[PDB]
Amino acid sequence: FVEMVDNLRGKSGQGYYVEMTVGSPPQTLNILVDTGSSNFAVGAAPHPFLHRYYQRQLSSTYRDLRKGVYVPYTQGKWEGELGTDLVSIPHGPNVTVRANIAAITESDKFFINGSNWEGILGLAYAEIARPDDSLEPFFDSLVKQTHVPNLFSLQLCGAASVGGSMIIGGIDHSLYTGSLWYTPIRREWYYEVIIVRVEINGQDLKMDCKEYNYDKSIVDSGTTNLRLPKKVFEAAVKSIKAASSTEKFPDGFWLGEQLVCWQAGTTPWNIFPVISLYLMGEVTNQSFRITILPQQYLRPVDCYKFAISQSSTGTVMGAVIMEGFYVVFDRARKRIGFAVSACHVHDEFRTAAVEGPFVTLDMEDCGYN
């Protein structure tokens, strides 16, 4: 899998992208890697923000599905024309598949001014594909048409340029240390999981665990922050406020509405607590925990942004979580694996951790229905 190592690039806060080719002859595009959606959609018109775009008129293998698709989402929208074409991944497996491609023809707040990507690769399941679940997501097409095993894994490395690895069809042991610990994929739509317990500096938040997953918890490479349900965010901030009493901060800061600054080099990591999420384990009454540092949740913009935010769509384990870990999207076995990332950023005192097993009762009650 060495050829796939370091196949991800990006700029801080603008997502991680992978190089792809579409059409014959192949057209090279950079594509945002998104485990939080399920469409393969590429710019197909000369939007001023785009370095390049899909030109269907140059492709002999293009097939028109003669159908439109309309996709608003919480932070923008895109609209496009459905088709199929030959798609490959230069720094992925040595294969070419015929996949659905939405040719983006109108969008709002979708493309980023200054970014180096031109499209989005939705790695989640058909249930949330647009316009409906009969539009086969790319990864399903890949697995159906080749011998590529039904899993992929992500090592997101963070820092400005960011880098990482998407290992398609397997797992690269050089990207992590210790053991992988697996949590069940609750349902195949988003990559949905169940959080059974939350600690701040080893101190249990002591909330009904249903709150942690109201109305869902997902693993999402297409979200920057750790996003937490409102009630849980509130409780987490109160505890983090308390744990970091050494200094005082404005209420806007905890809402991600203004930065806070330290004279360069004297940033006090130590006054900031670690955060632990316990995830439902593979066995009845068994869990494991993942632990991140302030290096993960205080984002550099020396100034810093608080990168934990409140949510009305449930818990979202975005880049803030994923950058601590090597994450295995084991589709074949309906589970997601976490191990300590070989690239994660740590000091000489504390370190991101994946630890188990723990005894946790009533974990089935933590899921929302």
Ligand SMILES: CC(C)COc1ccc2c(c1)[C@]1(COC(N)=N1)c1cc(-c3cncnc3)ccc1O2
């Ligand atoms: C299945 C439905 C409900 C959600 O569907 C969508 C559709 C489009 C869509 C995105 C999601 C989004 C927003 O969050 C995620 N995961 N992808 C998304 C995220 C980014 C993004 C990611 N990271 C950093 N900056 C921007 C850019 C575009 C973008 O577009």
